[PDB]
Each structure stands twice: as C-alpha cells, then as structure tokens.
Amino acid sequence: GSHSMRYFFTSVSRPGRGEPRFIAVGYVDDTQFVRFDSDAASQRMEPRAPWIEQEGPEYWDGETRKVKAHSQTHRVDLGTLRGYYNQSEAGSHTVQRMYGCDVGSDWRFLRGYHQYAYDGKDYIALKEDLRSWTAADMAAQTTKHKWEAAHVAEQLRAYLEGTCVEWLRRYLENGKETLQRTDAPKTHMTHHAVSDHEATLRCWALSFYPAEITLTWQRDGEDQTQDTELVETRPAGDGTFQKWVAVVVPSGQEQRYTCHVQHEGLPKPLTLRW
C-alpha cells in the first residue's frame, strides 16, 4: 500500500584543512535512487536507479544546484553549532539531517517529517502538524526562535504536502516495474544439532521487498519468544532483503514448532513446519 520518499544528509568536519565531507542520498521506499558525494569527481547528484535516468539535464542541474547549497548550509552549521557548544576547533563533528513524506494506498499525503541532529543526538525537529518545532536543548531553542521568526516551518510544509508528494507520485509511475512490485519472501527451514538432546530450527526469509516483515515462532499454537534468536533485517545487495529467526528445541520435539511469516507480498501469513 503505502510509500515514502526520504532524503538523508550527513556532514563531517575535517579539522586541519578544507570543507566538511558531505554525503546525500535519496530513497523511495527501500530503494536508493540518487546520491551526491563531496569526495567524488563528478561533483553532481548522480542517478542510482534505472528509472531516474529518464530525467533530463534540467532535473540534474537543479538537483545539483540545491544539493550544493545544502552542503554550504551544513558547513556553516558546524561552525555555529561549535560556537553554541563552546567546543574546540580541533575535534571532528557531525551534523545529520533527514526529511521526506509518506503517502497511504491512495498516494495522498499522510505524514511528513524533517529533523536535525548534531553529533548523533536530537537537535531540532518539526512536529507532526508541521507548524512548530521540538528543540531538545537551549542551543536548539535559539535555532527554533530564529526559524520561527523567519517562517521556515511554512516553507517546509508547502514542500512536504506539495512538491515532495507530487514527485513521489511521478517516481512511483515512471518506476512502476520495480517500485510497485512487491517481492514475497522465499522461505525455508534449516535444522542443526547442538548436543544429543537439543536442536536448532532456523526459519529463513530471502529476496523479499520491501524490507518490513514479521517472522515468529509458535509452540503448539502459542507464541514463543524464549530460546529464540532474531537477526536484524539485512540488505542482500541486489535491492532485496533477508532475515532469519531461530529457536532451540529438544530433539524429537521439532514438530510442535511452526515459523510464521508476514509480508505485504503475501495474501496471507505463510506457515512452515520441519
């Protein structure tokens, strides 16, 4: 159903010489589609999905122009923040920024976000209603007043409910072959013996898209979280994802245990036995 577009900016100061390293990436749902890297020779926003290539040189010049403006904003930010926090000119610091929009199964605006961190910690963020700000400390309180006075929230809100959503809709269309295709998990179970009385069952999910998924073990029809190990979902490297979950059971009792898989790509929860 739902879809999202998200942009990610990181800046990292280099004390000693030159401008900060700067890295921007754009995502639709779980698929990365653009990138800019300050330490790359092109000095341009660069396509990272086949469906974005269609776009003309006026898209690429405008995006570059804005992504370069961002880095200079991040550069200035590191200097000011370094003043607000009375820190030395010698340490290396990081600013992070994230924003984007979500749409439900009608591709109408649903949710929007825009937030900022300094050295990995909440700094300032836009509220759910897109009208006000959360400032985590007093230095962010200063920034909030500045942004309140110069009407930043207004501009952002128009972009998030306007532009963002409209180009998301654009991308979903030009990219339907991949972006609107769910890839259901291919599942299988493995079995391993640890001692002569105790076994391990491992339930796998592979090649599925999007990333969101649920894998759970049941015992005689009841949920079971004890003696079970669940790995962080991980990228396969070809645009799909993998995840497994394991349970330790007594030898011979393998058959009371069922693994349960839930994915947007499945009509109904899949069930696996040994």
Partner: peptide
C-alpha cells in the same frame, strides 16, 4: 526531488 532552499541553525 530535493527541497529548494535551506536555513542555517
């Protein structure tokens, strides 16, 4: 599609 303008902290 990136946001057009940006403000410093």
């Amino acid at each position: 599609c990136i946001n057009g303008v940006v403000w410093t902290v």
